[PDB]
């Protein structure tokens, strides 16, 4: 019927291979595990993860398989009443859009920027460089004010790209190559979209291979830096007093939730296209095994070249960094310096970057638009009218994160990645699918459906999963953030004022309030 499928499991394999791989493995990790003390991150993620990444993950993707309908309209069948988690994931996905293309626009201009014979963060000598200023060679001289001095990279980082106003109060004025970049990226998935230009054929193969084959020659590099053992201690060896803190709990909590694409109607959406007769458990096993992979793996070349730098600038390793947003593009940029032919391998990583997040970007795009589809399916799923739906929809998005390319737009950038599709929300919507899934719908009568589609019957480390361990995780952390509560500091320093809070919590509540919002609204009915 309308309704299609997938003409082979390779198709749905590499599409989910891009779709919860990509920026959130290689960029968001290292700055969350940094900011948050280091080894410390990791007890609380591998916690999460094998109790609830792979067991919602998987929940999803029979969910979709089980159902044949997108994000919103799963839960129609599933659970009339308690609809609405679909509506939170689409407001999560649609603020999440905008801010993870302003990545792809830095990255885009730091491609452009790539394309002469010296790299500009390689020295300071140019004229947005401080007095402050000087090679990181050089700084460790006993001569070379120990406090108020600074490295190229972050130099450029600051003012180049970015151009730090002193605060969210002064957003300044709008800069124009970071807006025609943004441009230049929205028109480039516009194009993919509409054509459906998209990876089929032999390009797959490459398409697949160059990434991880990248990642390979950066680990490398990194491990083979020297001063990589103390990066190596400060990323697996933890503090237990830091354990006490609710922010490390929440930090890798919502590491599991976001990399791996849940909660927010895509993976619904990958798996209601598949056969009913089709074993999705060893599969969806592999996928998460490789993801959870390659975040570790990633992990231990990002903390290598941490390691590297502290080493090199004569400071700890806990103030060497930005500690935000921005982490990997001091870190990686500075990696690709020490490598033979600088150039070459700089566009390489760049163009890795960019493909890394774009076939995501194209993922969750879809997933949106498919989700949003299926509310209407007379009105939508069409010719010219699917088009300038598509074009409406960049044009706003284009339109809200042009807020965020100003001089002060970095405050914008760091509140949406902390209030935005990450933290309470995630936390709220994956404990509001699981209690459903286990209490209401029931366990015991989910087994003998995937018996029926995969052909035997799965053991019960997943059905306790569902109903006792993801819940009480959720409900402790929510109750441990309320009642030790911390103010977010932009580099441990900026002091956010209370509009701008009240901001962030509205941003956050617009995804939170959906699921009341509508149970009220049935119950009124
Ligand atoms: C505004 C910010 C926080 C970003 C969120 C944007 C979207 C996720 C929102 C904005 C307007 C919302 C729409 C507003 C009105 C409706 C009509 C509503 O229709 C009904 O009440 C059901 C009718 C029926 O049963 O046919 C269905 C949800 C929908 C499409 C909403 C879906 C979600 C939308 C697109
Ligand atoms: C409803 C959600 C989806 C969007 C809400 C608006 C946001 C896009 C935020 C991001 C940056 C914010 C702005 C950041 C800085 C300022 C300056 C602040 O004070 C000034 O106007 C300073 C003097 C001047 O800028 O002329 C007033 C609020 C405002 C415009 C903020 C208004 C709200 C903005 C546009
Ligand atoms: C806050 C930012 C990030 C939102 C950016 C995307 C929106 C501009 C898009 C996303 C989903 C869109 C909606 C998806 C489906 C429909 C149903 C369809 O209904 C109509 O023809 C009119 C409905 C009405 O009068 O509300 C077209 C409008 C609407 C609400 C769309 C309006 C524009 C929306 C909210
Ligand atoms: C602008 C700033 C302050 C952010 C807050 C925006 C909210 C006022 C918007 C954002 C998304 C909206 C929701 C998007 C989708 C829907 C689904 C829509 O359809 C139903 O749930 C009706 C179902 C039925 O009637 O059978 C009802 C409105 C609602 C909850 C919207 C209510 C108003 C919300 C929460
Ligand atoms: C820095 O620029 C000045 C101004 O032209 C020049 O005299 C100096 O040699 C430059 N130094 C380096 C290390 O590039
Ligand atoms: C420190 O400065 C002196 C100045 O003569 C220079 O000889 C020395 O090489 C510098 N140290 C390093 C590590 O380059
Ligand atoms: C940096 O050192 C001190 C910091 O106490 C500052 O007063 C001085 O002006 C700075 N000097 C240089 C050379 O940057
Ligand atoms: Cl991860
Ligand atoms: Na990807
Ligand atoms: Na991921």
């Not at 779709?19 to 990790?29: A, C, D, H, I, S």
């Not at 361990?469 to 509560?485: A, R």
């Not at 911390?486 to 919590?505: C, D, H, Q, R, S």
């Amino acid at each position: 019927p309308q309704r299609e499928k997938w003409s082979s499991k390779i198709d749905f394999v590499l599409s989910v291979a891009g779709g919860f791989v990509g920026l959130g493995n290689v960029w968001r990790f290292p700055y969350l595990c940094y900011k948050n003390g280091g080894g410390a991150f990791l007890i609380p993620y591998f916690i999460f993860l094998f109790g609830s990444g792979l067991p919602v993950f998987f929940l999803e993707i029979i969910i979709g398989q089980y159902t044949s309908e997108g994000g919103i309209t799963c839960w129609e069948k599933i659970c009339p009443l308690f609809s609405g988690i679909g509506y939170a994931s689409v407001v999560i996905v649609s603020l999440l859009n905008v801010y993870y293309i302003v990545i792809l626009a830095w990255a885009t201009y730091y491609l452009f920027q790539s394309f002469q014979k010296e790299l500009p963060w390689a020295h300071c000598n140019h004229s947005w460089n401080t007095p402050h200023c000087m090679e990181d060679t050089m700084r460790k001289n006993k001569s070379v004010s120990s406090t108020n001095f600074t490295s190229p990279v972050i130099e450029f980082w600051e003012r180049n790209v970015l151009s730090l106003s002193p605060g969210i109060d002064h957003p300044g004025s709008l800069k124009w190559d970071l807006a025609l970049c943004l441009l230049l990226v929205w028109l480039v998935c516009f194009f993919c979209i509409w054509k459906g230009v998209r990876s089929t054929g032999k390009v797959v193969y490459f398409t697949a291979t160059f990434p991880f084959a990248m990642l390979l020659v950066l680990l490398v590099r990194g491990l083979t830096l020297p001063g990589a053992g103390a990066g190596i201690k400060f990323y697996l060896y933890p503090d237990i007093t830091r354990l006490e803190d609710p922010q490390v709990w929440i930090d890798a909590g919502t590491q599991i939730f976001f990399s791996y694409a849940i909660c927010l109607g895509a993976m619904t959406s990958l798996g209601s296209y598949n056969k009913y007769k089709y074993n999705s458990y060893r599969d969806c096993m592999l996928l998460g095994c490789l993801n959870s992979g390659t975040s570790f793996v990633s992990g231990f070349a990002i903390f290598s070249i941490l390691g590297f730098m502290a080493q090199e600038q004569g400071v700890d390793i806990a103030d060497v960094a930005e500690s935000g947003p921005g982490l990997a593009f001091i870190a990686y940029p500075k990696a690709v310096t020490m490598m033979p032919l600088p150039t070459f391998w700089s566009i390489l990583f760049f163009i890795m970057l960019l493909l890394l997040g774009l076939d995501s970007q194209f993922v969750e795009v879809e997933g949106q638009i498919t989700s949003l589809v299926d509310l209407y399916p007379s009105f939508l799923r069409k010719g010219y009218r699917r088009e300038i739906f598509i074009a409406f929809v960049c044009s706003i998005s284009y339109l809200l994160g042009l807020t965020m390319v100003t001089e002060g737009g970095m405050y914008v950038f760091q509140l949406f990645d902390y209030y935005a599709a990450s933290g309470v929300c995630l936390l709220w919507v994956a404990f509001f699918e699981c209690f459903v899934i286990a209490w209401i719908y029931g366990g015991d009568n989910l087994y003998d459906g995937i018996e029926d589609m995969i052909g035997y019957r799965p053991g019960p480390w997943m059905k306790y999963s569902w109903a006792v361990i993801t819940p009480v995780l959720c409900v402790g952390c929510f109750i441990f953030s309320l009642v030790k509560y911390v103010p977010l500091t932009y580099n441990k320093t900026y002091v956010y004022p209370n509009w701008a809070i009240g901001l962030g919590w509205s941003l956050a509540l617009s995804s939170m309030l959906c699921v009341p919002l509508v149970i009220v609204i049935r119950l009124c009915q």
